[PDB]
Amino acid sequence: DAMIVIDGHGIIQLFSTAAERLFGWSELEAIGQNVNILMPEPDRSRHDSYISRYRTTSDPHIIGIGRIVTGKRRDGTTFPMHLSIGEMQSGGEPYFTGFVRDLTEH
Ligand code: HEM
Ligand SMILES: [Cl-]
Ligand code: NA
Ligand code: NA
């Protein structure tokens, strides 16, 4: 339902309408920010590493695999969500697409 697209450095490039309702940020506020603003520690402080790691090893842990994780809303509250992630190229640069499913109220 909710879709988020980030660039190779973790910066949000697209934030769908459902994502706004789910995380509390507006599309304009979300775009330009690191995707780690949507998660609690320790993932938050480590997410950039996860991405760099994947980019240098090309060994997926979540891409094409999926996982249930905890996200964080604008107000600071945490919730369960399923995440599916894909990768694609545009203009020779990588972009990651994420499908987010809220398990708090599906
Ligand atoms: C908001 C909650 C999110 C959490 C808690 C989270 C958590 C994580 C975790 C735990 C890993 C590494 C897993 C491991 O090493 O075992 C990871 C990897 C990754 N995440 Fe996230 N993530 C979140 C959102 C996103 C979104 C929205 C995208 C993309 C639009 C994204 C893209 C990636 C990428 C590219 C990787 C590396 C790919 C891989 O290792 O398969 N993440 N994330
Ligand atoms: Cl999946
Ligand atoms: Na912005
Ligand atoms: Na899975």
For β-strands 12-15 and 78-90, DSSP reports them as unpaired
For residues 12 and 35, the answer to whether their CB atoms sit within 8 Å is yes
**Domain ranges for the chain:** 1-106
Quickly tell me which residue has 């775009």 as its tokens: 31
- The beta strand positions in the chain, using DSSP E, are 2-7, 12-15, 67-72, 78-90, 93-102
Which CATH number applies to 1-106? 3.30.450.20
What are the helix (H) ranges across 12-65?
17-23, 27-30, 43-57
Nearest to 73 by CA among 46, 97, 51, 105: 105
Ligand 1 atom closest to Cα of residue 70: 5
For residues 5 and 105, the answer to whether their CB atoms sit within 8 Å is no
98: helix, strand or coil:
strand
The response to whether residue 60 sits with its C-beta less than 6 Å from ligand 1 reads: yes
38, 45, 49, 50, best to mutate for ligand 1 pocket (most atoms within 8 Å of CB): 50
CB atoms within 10 A of CB 86: 12
Nearest to 33 by CA among 22, 18, 17, 48: 48
What is the distance of C-alpha 40 from the center of its chain? 12
